[PDB]
Design a protein around this ligand. Structure first.
Ligand code: CLA
Ligand code: CLA
Ligand code: CLA
Ligand code: CLA
Ligand code: CLA
Ligand code: CLA
Ligand code: A86
Ligand code: A86
Ligand code: A86
Ligand code: A86
Ligand code: KC1
Lengths: 188, 174, 150, 208
């Protein structure tokens, strides 16, 4: 049986289309890793966390570069968010350190939930029970569509958040005016 | 199964029975320490910060003892510690805390290793006559109120003593 | 509360059907549609009061004259309303919370409120026009000029 | 589709069914062919009905017919002092135009919501009466089609022939009112109306 994404390659044996974004795209065989505290559960939890962090980072850039910083943080004034971080750190550094320790407690608890959820079987990877509106209660076909839409928007936002870091740390302008610069440079 | 505070985590089973139970022990301190030692430490940490928050915000609201000693004068709640180690006030309270904590050390050892049957946090102190023949469900809601107001005061004192040093200003940050 | 009990309010006369172009009532559960109904009336009943306050003082400069104590006082005052809203929704209800068994509009706080299901259909519609009236008074008044043009 | 051929045969026994573009065999919103063929019948009847009130309304408002009394709180009569009726729509007001448009917009709304729709069991052009359908809370005295009752008692065959001479007088007034407004923007566009039409030369196809 061949991979859908790479039809010249065989299907990776631990990927069977059960997870949401599974089209058999593992050419390096990384889903077969089972040694240094890392397996398919750990990589799926890492993918989903990289999905959700990058999804929030993209709209977190596009909120400030369109509507400005939040009130109490009007000292930013820079569209480059890699530089606007250091103006908030320059004036109100305690709230960033408030969030970074609040993340530190959340992430250390999530690291226990990952390794206890792997040893047992009562936790899907990336699952925290955070469904307060309750989309997962009915229409399992429509709930698997939301599981696939999270992965599809999250895999796209991974490139976008990594790009906005890198083309913010190299052009020092901001994402949306990097976009206008590219539009006038490559117009035909 | 399925701890309440962290529903993505299994239940730490040594928490069952004790009264402030939300299923919240992700670091599994209950699997290392006995839960009588941890509840006694939680209650004592909470009872100190209930007094410590109230004593910090009263001295910074200008409440002083009468007659005020002349070495007690010109002090806020931040500078009151170091000035009264010199005067001897802090050495006086440390004496009577050490008197109580030496007897509590006999009580904690007898609770853990001699099996006194003593509740953690219990010192027999009820002069005003609460829990007067009340049910076990009524002493448990009162024990829950002590721990949650205890747990709140520890974060409440931690704010009021950190923000006091960061500003050295008027009341609502000191 | 089921899905068809949520979408029976208000009447669907002025459009013709239930107006859901994006299909947002079909994705989720009946618990999710009850959150959509409770947040519509909470958005409406706030924007109804906030609309006439623009005319009771007539805008953006009036909030800046409120001190840091005055901003902090009334915002956590409505927070203790909305705290005890969901609290009295849970413990003092014959059914329970609006996402569990309760009415999504009933807004249980005693004293803030003081033939009625007909008024339930009229509170939403008179609230819906206020939210586009308030979002007018933020956009047609302030951010650009020639929006409505009324 | 079978009845659309039977309608157009009675409108013209020479030209039985005329469709170069074959628009009668299409759908629009994915309904079916038979539901959009009632949309096309409604839209043709509505286009012809409007244009035939527009043709009478042109020749009244192109000559000097300003009727008393002006209904305003200051003065400001019906702006026939230009005259030239495409100019005279511009000179109403800006705020008077929304009162004319939204009132027709209720009749456009009431023809859709009330008793039965043309993209269903049909009879397109049949305006539902205001007496029924229970949606309007006033209630109002008269109806749009028969306010005075003229003329109930006409048989089916007497009114089936009516729409066929409403469709043919509606098709001609579509050509009629557009031949006026073409000379209001390009002259020589209709050959027999040279010199009569005073070249409005603005934009007839824009309200405000
Ligand atoms: C990758 C995510 C991310 C990061 C690192 C930042 C970082 C920042 N934002 Mg941005 N922002 C984000 C997403 C993010 N934001 C999103 C999603 C939005 C809405 C679209 C915004 C809208 C926004 C505005 C309007 C403004 C900022 C501003 C800022 C800066 C100061 C704010 C601060 O330090 O708060 C301190 C941190 C906290 C108060 C708490 C953080 C959240 C905690 C940790 C809960 C997280 C829960 C998690 C999301 C989900 C549950 C996890 C687990 C249970 C599974 C800071 C650099 C301000 C600025 O200065 O711009 C220059 C500003 O005005 N942000
Ligand atoms: C993005 C994250 C973020 C961060 C780091 C801050 C940080 C701050 N805010 Mg802001 N605020 C935020 C989001 C944020 N806010 C959002 C999303 C809103 C609603 C739009 C506000 C509405 C707001 C108001 C009305 C005020 C603050 C104020 C403050 C400052 C004092 C905190 C306080 O009010 O103590 C007490 C502090 C620098 C205060 C301030 O100093 O404003 C200049 C203040 O008056 N905030
Ligand atoms: C998430 C996706 C994503 C997107 C959309 C962008 C977009 C951009 N990046 Mg970023 N970037 C990304 C991720 C992304 N990046 C990642 C993952 C990294 C590494 C971490 C970077 C690191 C980076 C750096 C260091 C820089 C950029 C820059 C740019 C800009 C350069 C223009 C460009 O090459 O567009 C991509 C071009 C195309 C996609 C071509 C379009 C092809 C068309 C649509 C095909 C249609 C052809 C058709 C079939 C033929 C028929 C038509 C014909 C008959 C006429 C552009 C805004 C530069 C910048 O900031 O400029 C100011 C820059 O310096 N990027
Ligand atoms: C965490 C416990 C704690 C500690 C270490 C301190 C430490 C201090 N306080 Mg005190 N304070 C506290 C709690 C505490 N406070 C509480 C809870 C109150 C409210 C009653 C106060 C009200 C207070 C005032 C008005 C003043 C101080 C002052 C001081 C400083 C001088 C020494 C002194 O003992 O003053 C005197 C201490 C008291 C008046 C508090 C008495 C202890 C309370 C009542 C707890 C005892 C509860 C217990 C159940 C009572 C037993 C009853 C039983 C026998 C029947 C010193 C830094 C003085 C100062 O800062 O001058 C610059 C000062 O003027 N504090
Ligand atoms: C609901 C949104 C809202 C908000 C955020 C504000 C905010 C403000 N108002 Mg405005 N105002 C509002 C609606 C609002 N108003 C309404 C609905 C009225 C008519 C009653 C007014 C009449 C008014 C006057 C005459 C004045 C202000 C002023 C002010 C400013 C400072 C003083 C103040 O806090 O007033 C207090 C808050 C209110 C008066 C609004 C209360 C709304 C009630 C609680 C709604 C619920 C009623 C409910 C049906 C029954 C409950 C009864 C129970 C409360 C007893 C502040 C910017 C002052 C100003 O500086 O103008 C430039 C000023 O002189 N307001
Ligand atoms: C085709 C649609 C149509 C439209 C958009 C207009 C528009 C106008 N008419 Mg005209 N009119 C029309 C048909 C139309 N008319 C018809 C069919 C007649 C013969 C009954 C008239 C007889 C007429 C007179 C005597 C006057 C106007 C005037 C006006 C102008 C302003 C007052 C008004 O709206 O009266 C409301 C519209 C009516 C009273 C006509 C009713 C149209 C229905 C469909 C026919 C049923 C009767 C405005 C440009 C006035 C003006 O001041 O011109 C500068 C004016 O004095 N109209
Ligand atoms: C070769 C060339 O170049 O041509 C040139 C020259 C020329 C001629 C100028 C041109 C033109 C313009 C033209 C031909 C315009 C034609 C306009 C047209 C055809 C207008 C129909 C109006 C009917 C109305 C308004 C009202 C009915 C009103 C009512 C109430 C009823 O019918 C009801 C009724 O039925 C019932 C229901 C019941 C019965 O009780 C009887 C009655 C009657 C009461 C051109 C093409 O532009 C260019
Ligand atoms: O042109 C465009 C742009 C433009 C110009 C922006 C527009 C606008 C502005 C709009 C639409 C503004 C807002 C409209 C809205 C929705 C305003 C609600 C107010 C409710 C209030 C003030 C408060 C209490 C009202 C209360 C408390 C009650 O009704 C009480 C009551 O019901 C009960 C509770 C119990 C009964 O026993 C007794 C009664 C029945 C009395 C247009 C015209 O729309 C369109
Ligand atoms: C049911 C129904 O009825 O509808 C049906 C049936 C029906 C009616 C039959 C239909 C039809 C048939 C139609 C409409 C046929 C029309 C075809 C058309 C419109 C053919 C244009 C040729 C122009 C050329 C080759 C220009 C060369 C110009 C050149 C080479 C120039 O140098 C241009 C010039 O400016 C410059 C650049 C430079 C100057 O130095 C010189 C000038 C000024 C001259 C429909 C609508 O399709 C469908
Ligand atoms: C050779 C061949 O095969 O041909 C084929 C080709 C083709 C295309 C395939 C086919 C077709 C379909 C056709 C021809 C469609 C064209 C239809 C046409 C010509 C439709 C105009 C309607 C006018 C309206 C709606 C409004 C007037 C507007 C009015 C009356 C007003 O609003 C008021 C106003 O006026 C007054 C009253 C007073 C003034 O103060 C103000 C103004 C001026 C505003 C055919 C049938 O098969 C024939
Ligand atoms: C902040 C949250 C909140 C709570 C938790 C709460 C609770 C109670 N209120 Mg309410 N109240 C408001 C808010 C709150 N009230 C507000 C913002 C107003 C407008 C100023 C208001 C007005 C009145 C009036 C006129 C009366 C009143 C009463 C009660 C009483 C009985 C409940 C019931 O009515 O069933 C309970 C304790 C009656 C009373 O005083 O009984 C002795 C009474 O007559 N309230």
């Amino acid at each position: 049986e061949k991979s859908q994404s790479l039809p010249f390659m065989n299907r990776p044996p631990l990927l069977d289309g059960s997870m949401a974004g599974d089209v058999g795209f593992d050419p390096l065989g990384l889903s077969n890793i089972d040694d240094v505290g890392i397996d398919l559960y750990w990589l799926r939890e890492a993918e989903i966390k990289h999905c959700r962090v990058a999804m929030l980072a993209v709209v977190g850039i596009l909120q400030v570069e369109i509507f400005g910083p939040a009130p109490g943080c009007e000292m930013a004034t820079d569209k480059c968010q890699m530089d606007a971080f250091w103006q908030i750190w320059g004036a109100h550094p305690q709230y960033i350190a408030f969030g970074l320790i609040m993340i530190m407690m959340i992430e250390m608890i999530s690291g226990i939930a990952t390794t206890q959820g792997r040893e047992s079987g009562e936790r899907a990877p990336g699952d925290f029970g955070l469904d307060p509106l309750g989309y997962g209660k009915g229409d399992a076909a429509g709930y698997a569509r939301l599981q696939a839409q999270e992965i599809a928007n999250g895999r796209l936002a991974m490139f976008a958040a990594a790009g906005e870091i890198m083309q913010g740390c190299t052009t020092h302008q901001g994402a949306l005016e990097n976009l206008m610069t590219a539009l006038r440079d490559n117009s035909f | 199964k399925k701890s309440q505070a962290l529903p993505f985590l299994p239940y730490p089973e040594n928490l069952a029975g004790y009264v402030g139970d939300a299923g919240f022990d992700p670091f599994r301190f209950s699997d290392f320490a006995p839960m009588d030692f941890l509840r006694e430490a939680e209650i004592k940490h909470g009872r100190i910060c209930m007094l410590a928050w109230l004593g910090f915000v009263a001295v910074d609201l200008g409440a002083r003892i009468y007659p005020l000693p002349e070495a007690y004068e010109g002090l806020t709640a931040v500078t009151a510690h170091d000035a009264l180690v010199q005067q001897g006030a802090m050495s006086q309270i440390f004496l009577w805390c050490s008197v109580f904590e030496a007897i509590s050390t006999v009580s904690v050892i007898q609770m853990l290793y001699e099996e006194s049957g003593r509740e953690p946090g219990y010192f027999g102190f009820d002069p005003l006559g609460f829990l007067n023949g009340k049910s076990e469900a009524e002493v448990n809601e009162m024990k829950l109120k002590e721990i949650k107001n205890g747990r709140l005061a520890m974060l409440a004192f931690s704010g009021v003593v950190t923000q006091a040093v960061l500003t050295q200003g008027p009341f609502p940050y000191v | 509360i089921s899905k068809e009990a949520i979408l029976s309010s208000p009447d669907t006369t002025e459009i013709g059907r239930v107006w859901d172009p994006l299909g947002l009532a079909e994705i989720g559960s009946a618990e999710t549609l009850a959150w959509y109904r409770h947040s519509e009336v909470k958005h409406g009943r706030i924007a109804m009061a906030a609309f006439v306050g623009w005319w009771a003082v007539g805008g953006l400069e009036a909030w800046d004259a409120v001190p840091g104590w005055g901003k902090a006082q009334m915002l956590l005052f409505a927070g203790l309303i909305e705290f005890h809203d969901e609290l009295f929704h849970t413990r003092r209800t014959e059914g329970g919370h609006y996402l569990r068994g309760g009415t999504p509009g009933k807004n249980m706080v005693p004293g803030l409120f003081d033939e009625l299901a007909k008024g339930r259909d009229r509170e939403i519609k008179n609230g819906r026009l206020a939210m586009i009236g308030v979002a007018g008074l933020y956009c047609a008044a302030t951010i650009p000029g020639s929006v409505p043009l009324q | 589709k079978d009845d659309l051929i039977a309608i157009a045969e009675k409108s013209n026994p020479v030209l039985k069914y005329y469709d170069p573009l074959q628009l009668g065999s299409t759908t629009i919103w994915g309904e079916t062919n038979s539901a959009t063929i009632g949309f096309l019948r409604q839209s043709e009847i509505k286009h012809g009905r409007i244009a035939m009130a527009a043709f009478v309304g042109y020749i009244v408002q192109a000559n000097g017919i300003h009727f008393p009394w002006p209904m305003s709180f200051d003065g400001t009569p019906f702006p026939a002092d230009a005259g030239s009726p495409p100019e005279q729509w511009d000179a109403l007001s800006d705020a008077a135009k929304w009162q004319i448009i939204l009132f027709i917009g209720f009749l456009e709304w009431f023809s859709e919501a009330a008793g039965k729709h043309y993209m269903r069991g049909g009879k397109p052009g049949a305006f539902p009466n205001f007496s029924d359908s229970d949606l309007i809370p006033h209630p109002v005295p008269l109806n749009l089609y028969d306010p005075f009752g003229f003329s109930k008692g006409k048989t089916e065959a007497q009114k089936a022939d009516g729409l066929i001479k409403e469709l043919n007088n509606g098709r001609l007034a579509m050509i009629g009112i557009m031949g006026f407004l073409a000379e209001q923007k390009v002259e020589g566009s209709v050959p027999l109306l040279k010199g009569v039409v005073p070249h409005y030369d603005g934009e007839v196809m824009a309200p405000f």
